[PDB]
Design a protein around this nucleic acid. Structure first.
Ligand SMILES: [Mg+2]
Length: 643
RNA sequence: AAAAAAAAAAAAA
C-alpha cells in the first residue's frame, strides 16, 4: 500500500470507503473493455485493465469513479462467479494445459490441471468437466480450473450427447438396477386378456405405456378402457429400484436414444404393453356421453391385458384418411380404431365446449445414421392418430384427478395458474393499448383465461399473443388439486406414463390404495421439487443436443442459396431469431443483414418489431424466407440471411 | 454492439 500514515491513513481509508458502489453483472466485448450492467437502463464502463479481474457474467460489486469523459467501474468484490462447474475442450501439452469453457461467450482458455485421484491422462482435444478453483477477485493470482471428470475424446461421434449430459449432470446410462419379482399387492386383477386392446405409437417406441379398448353401449354412449403399464407391481415404495427411480424423475429422451428411468428390461420389455404378450395393467373404465362428458361411474381397477396390435400413428392416420399401404389386419382391430376415432371426435368436442384446445405445432424427429450422423430432421405433424391417444390420455388423467380428489384429497397434480396475479394489471393494460379489451381480475379466473384465449386464437396472426408470452406462467407440480389454466380444467393429474415418470408411479400407488380401500400417505411437497428440477434439466438437455445436431446438419448448407421458410420467433437489439419451419432449427439473423445503415434501423424487443425508416418491415410472428449464411461449429450457431 | 446456456399449454416418446 501507500504507507506514510500519521492519521492520513485513516483519512484515505474513510475516503475510499465512502465512494459509491454498484452491484451488477459483467458484460465483456470483442475489445479489451467491458461494462457493469446494473439494471436494463444503467451501466458503467469497465477499463481494459479492470476487465482482467473479471469474467463475462460474473456478478460483482464495483467502486465508481467519476472520470473526465464518463463514470467508470472498478471491480472490488465478487458476489457470484458466473462459472463454477463447467464443461469444455482441453488445449495444451502435457503438464501445461488449459480448458476453454463451452459457453459461447467465453472464448478464453483457462489454465488447469487434473484432480488428484483421476485416472485419465488428460490431453489436447478431449472434453472434460472442470471446476473453477481460482478467481482474481478472490485475491488469487489469476483464473484457474481443475479438470474433474473426463467426458470423452473430441472425435467421439456422440460428443453432443455426452457433453450435454455432463453439462447438466444427467445420467448417461440406463439404470444399473435389476427387475426382481412381481409383487402381490392384494389386488384382484380382472382378466381382460381376451379383449381387443391396442396400442398406438411411434414406430420406434419400445416402452408402450398405454393401451386402449373401446366398446359401443346403448344410448349412443361409448365406453373406453385405458390400460396403463404398471412398473409399481414390480417396484415397492421404498425399494432400491424405487429410490433410484425417484432420483432420475423422468426418462430422458434425446435424438436417437433415451436414458430410461427404470431398468431397461422392465421398461422396454416386462412392463411395456407389447403386442401379443400378457401384461399387468392398472386400468380405468369410463363411460362417455353423446356430447363426450365423462359420466360419473368411473372405475379404477387392476387388470391383465394382452394387446392385439402395436399400431403406429402415421399408419393409423393414413388409414382413417385412407391412403398408404397399411390396413388393420383384422376386422376386430379395425372396429377398435374407428370406435377410438369416435371417442376422439366426442372428446375434442367436449374440450372445445367446456375447456381449451391448444392449437398444436409439429414435432421434429432426428433421423440418425449408424455413426450418429443426422440424415434428416423431419416435421412430424399431429394428425388424428395422435389426437386419438391424446384425447384418451387427457380423459384418463381427468378421471384420476377426480378420483384422487374425491377419495384422498391429495395426489401428484399438474397445476397451471395461467397468468401470475402480480402481472394481471400489466397484461390488461398492454392488450387494451393494442385495442383488445381485457379485465385483469377476470383474466385470473379460469373462464376469464379461456375467454381471452379464444379471442386470441381468433386473431389473424399470433402477434398479440407473442406480446403477452412474457406474462405466462409454467405448469408446476403440486401435491394437492389446483386449476390447470392452459388445459382449461379444474384439476388434472397424470398417471398414464409410469414407465417414464416417477410422478405417475406415485399416482399409481395412490390409485391402488383407493382401489383397495386403503389408507394413503400424502406425498411430501419436496419430491415435487426433485421432479420439477429434473423436468427442467431434461427439457434443456433435449433442446441442447438438438441445437448441436441442427448445426452439424445445416453445416453444408452455409453459403448456398437453398431457401428455408422461417417464422420470426424473437427480436433483440442484436437482430432476430427465426425457426426454420420444416426442420425446426433456430437461426440468428444479425441486424446489419436487415439494413446495413444502423441509423435507420430499430430492433425493439418490447415492441417485438423491426423498423426501417419508421415503417415496420418485420414483427415477431411473420413468415419470411431465408438462406443459411454461416454456421459456426465452435459455438453451434446458425446465421441466416433473408431473401 | 453479430445476439445467446428458460419451456406459455398438451400428447406420445
Ligand atoms: Mg404410448
Amino acid at each position: 500500500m501507500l504507507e506514510a500514515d500519521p492519521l492520513l491513513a485513516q483519512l484515505k481509508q474513510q475516503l475510499h470507503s465512502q465512494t459509491p458502489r454498484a452491484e451488477g453483472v459483467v458484460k465483456a466485448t470483442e475489445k479489451g473493455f467491458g461494462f457493469l450492467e446494473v439494471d436494463a437502463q444503467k451501466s458503467y464502463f469497465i477499463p481494459p485493465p479492470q476487465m482482467k479481474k473479471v469474467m463475462h457474467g460474473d456478478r460483482i460489486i464495483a467502486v465508481i469513479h467519476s472520470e473526465k469523459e464518463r463514470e467508470s467501474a472498478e471491480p472490488e468484490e465478487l458476489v457470484e462467479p458466473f462459472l463454477t462447474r463447467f464443461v469444455g475442450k482441453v488445449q495444451g501439452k502435457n503438464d501445461r494445459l488449459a480448458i476453454v469453457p463451452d459457453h459461447p461467450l467465453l472464448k478464453d482458455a483457462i489454465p488447469c490441471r487434473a484432480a488428484r485421484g483421476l485416472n485419465h491422462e488428460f490431453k489436447e482435444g478431449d472434453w472434460a468437466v472442470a471446476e473453477m478453483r481460482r478467481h482474481p477477485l478472490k485475491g488469487d493470482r489469476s483464473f484457474y480450473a481443475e479438470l474433474t471428470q473426463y467426458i470423452t475424446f473430441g472425435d467421439d461421434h456422440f460428443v453432443p450427447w455426452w457433453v450435454t449430459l455432463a453439462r447438466h449432470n444427467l445420467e448417461k446410462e440406463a439404470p444399473d438396477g435389476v427387475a426382481t419379482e412381481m409383487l402381490d399387492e392384494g389386488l384382484v386383477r380382472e382378466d381382460l386378456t381376451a379383449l381387443d386392446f391396442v396400442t398406438i405409437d411411434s414406430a420406434s417406441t419400445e416402452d408402450m405405456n398405454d393401451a386402449l379398448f373401446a366398446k359401443a353401449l346403448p344410448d349412443d354412449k361409448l365406453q373406453l378402457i385405458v390400460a396403463i403399464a404398471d412398473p409399481t407391481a414390480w417396484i415397492a415404495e421404498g425399494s432400491k429400484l424405487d429410490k433410484a427411480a425417484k432420483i432420475r424423475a423422468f426418462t430422458n429422451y434425446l435424438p436417437g436414444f433415451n436414458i430410461p428411468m427404470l431398468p431397461r428390461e422392465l421398461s422396454d420389455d416386462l412392463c411395456s404393453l407389447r403386442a401379443n404378450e400378457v401384461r399387468p395393467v392398472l386400468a380405468c373404465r369410463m363411460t362417455l356421453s353423446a356430447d363426450g362428458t365423462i359420466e360419473d361411474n368411473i372405475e379404477f381397477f387392476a387388470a391383465t391385458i394382452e394387446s392385439k396390435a402395436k399400431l403406429v400413428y402415421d399408419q393409423v392416420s393414413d388409414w382413417l384418411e385412407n391412403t398408404g399401404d397399411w390396413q388393420p389386419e383384422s376386422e376386430a382391430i379395425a372396429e377398435q380404431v374407428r370406435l377410438l376415432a369416435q371417442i376422439c371426435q366426442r372428446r375434442g368436442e367436449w374440450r372445445h365446449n367446456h375447456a381449451l384446445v391448444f392449437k398444436d405445432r409439429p414435432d421434429y424427429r432426428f433421423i440418425l445414421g449408424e455413426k450418429g450422423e443426422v440424415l434428416d430432421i423431419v416435421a412430424e405433424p399431429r394428425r388424428i392418430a395422435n389426437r386419438i391417444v391424446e384425447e384418451a390420455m387427457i380423459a384418463a388423467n381427468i378421471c384420476a384427478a377426480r378420483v384422487l380428489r374425491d377419495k384422498l384429497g391429495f395426489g401428484i397434480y399438474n397445476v397451471h395458474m395461467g397468468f401470475d396475479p402480480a402481472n394481471a394489471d400489466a397484461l390488461a393494460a398492454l392488450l387494451k393499448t393494442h385495442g383488445l379489451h381485457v379485465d385483469a381480475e377476470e383474466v385470473l379466473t379460469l373462464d376469464g383465461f379461456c375467454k381471452l384465449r379464444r379471442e386470441l386464437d381468433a386473431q389473424p396472426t399470433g402477434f398479440l399473443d407473442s406480446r403477452i408470452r412474457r406474462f405466462q406462467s409454467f405448469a408446476e407440480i403440486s401435491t394437492e388439486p389446483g386449476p390447470h389454466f392452459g388445459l382449461g380444467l379444474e384439476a388434472y393429474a397424470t398417471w398414464t406414463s409410469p414407465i417414464r415418470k416417477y410422478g405417475d408411479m406415485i399416482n399409481h400407488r395412490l390409485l391402488k390404495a383407493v382401489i383397495k380401500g386403503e389408507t394413503a400417505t400424502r406425498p411430501q411437497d419436496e419430491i415435487t421439487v426433485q421432479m420439477a428440477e429434473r423436468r427442467r434439466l431434461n427439457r434443456m438437455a433435449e433442446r441442447d443436443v438438438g441445437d448441436w445436431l441442427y448445426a452439424r446438419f445445416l453445416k453444408d448448407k452455409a453459403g448456398t442459396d437453398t431457401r428455408f421458410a422461417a417464422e420470426i420467433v424473437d427480436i433483440s437489439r442484436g437482430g432476430m431469431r427465426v425457426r426454420l419451419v420444416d426442420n425446426g432449427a433456430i437461426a440468428f439473423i444479425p441486424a446489419p443483414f436487415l439494413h446495413a445503415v444502423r441509423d435507420e434501423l430499430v430492433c425493439s424487443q418490447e415492441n417485438g418489431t423491426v423498423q426501417i425508416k419508421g415503417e415496420t418491415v418485420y414483427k415477431v410472428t411473420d413468415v419470411i424466407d431465408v438462406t443459411i449464411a454461416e454456421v459456426r461449429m465452435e459455438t453451434r450457431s446458425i446465421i441466416a440471411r433473408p431473401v
